[PDB]
Ligand binder design. Sequence first.
Ligand SMILES: Nc1ncnc2c1ncn2[C@@H]1O[C@H](COP(=O)(O)OP(=O)(O)O)[C@@H](O)[C@H]1O
Ligand code: ALF
Ligand SMILES: [Mg+2]
Length: 436
Amino acid sequence: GLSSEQQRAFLAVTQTPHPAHLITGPAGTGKTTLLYALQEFYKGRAVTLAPTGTAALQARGQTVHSFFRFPARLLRYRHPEDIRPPGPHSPLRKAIEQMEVLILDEVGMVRVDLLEAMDWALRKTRKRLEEPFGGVKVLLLGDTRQLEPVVPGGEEALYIARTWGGPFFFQAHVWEEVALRVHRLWESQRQREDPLFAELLKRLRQGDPQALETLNRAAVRPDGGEEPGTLILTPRRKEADALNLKRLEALPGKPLEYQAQVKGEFAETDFPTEAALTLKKGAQVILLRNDPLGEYFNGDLGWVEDLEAEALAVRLKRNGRRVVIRPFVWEKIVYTYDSEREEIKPQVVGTFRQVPVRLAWALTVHKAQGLTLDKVHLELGRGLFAHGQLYVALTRVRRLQDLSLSRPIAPTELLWRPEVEVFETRIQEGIWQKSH
DNA sequence: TTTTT
Ligand SMILES: Nc1ncnc2c1ncn2[C@@H]1O[C@H](COP(=O)(O)OP(=O)(O)O)[C@@H](O)[C@H]1O
Ligand code: ALF
Ligand SMILES: [Mg+2]
């Protein structure tokens, strides 16, 4: 059963007709477990989404993009080219028209344009433009001290800056129309058997520099990444590639390389997986795209069973089933202000065809937000770059003995967004309503 | 840098 404070938030959300709620609290407080209780209460009437594939699977839902069929690009504000309602007889329209509750987990990683598109898509599909989210009761769960939304430095950043003032979900203009009720969780459930670890992460969350010095003196163990049962977390994908290639060297399978087809402008830093992707049987991998048939999803973990020319078999950890993987296509979209109109336009400039597979003995910290891991080693690589990155990497485990780091961390590496300090301040009053 | 399709 749930804890005292989780059940209090359960009743606060289900016993009132208010249409917008946020359940928020530190890492491991039980938000997604409370989400489980909400799914069973609501059962068929609620849709569960999340921004990332790993979080969606952790929430037992799907990604926001794949539910609304949003394209993987900047969703311009109420733009018909970007937010397209489903057809008159489509299965998705029936789902949107009948839906009564939308549950959105890991809302801290939902960018502001994504949240605004969900609002507008629901209003347009349900034919209710006057009501926020088209009259659906939205239940948001997440932590703004965890990872900030991903914002590439194109004209996207300028456009998000001009339209909303920043990238976070609480900067959406829909909060000018409806008040967001905030309910808070405080007790760590993940670190419940290790109360001094839980208190260390609390002080780390407040930015305590003695908690960092305590962490460094206790958790810095360079060889910790080679111990069995250990998931390695890195800030960057290229850093995970070099660590994965080391564990792959030790596998006795005969290797096979999967050669990507690249066309047009598509630079290597933008590749979702290596262009010369080499794999062996038994290798640990994560899948990067959703199956059109529904057998696997972006974020599924599993191991390689068979490797053939343009097809391989993967044994999924999620359900112990065997799925066959084929090449997918990724587009590279860029935005130009050309030339002196008052708008920017997206354009496809390159494509990347490759198996949607990547080795997963080491993952990015982004792909780990939401997970409880048995043992983690943080490889700092060339350093942290994202608000909340460090805190997510440290809060995945239940006990301090389950956590190691490749090097000590200086306090000058801690990042803080002032947008999150005003938000965290105002929502202590139990309410968030956006001004102006 | 990172995510989404
Ligand atoms: N009431 C509870 N009793 C026992 N274990 C719990 C409870 N709530 C959560 N957990 C466990 O604690 C861990 C973290 O909970 P989770 O819901 O994933 O927190 P969050 O979503 O805030 O990170 C998971 O292993 C979960 O199963
Ligand atoms: F939702 Al979390 F750690 F905050 F899984
Ligand atoms: Mg969670």
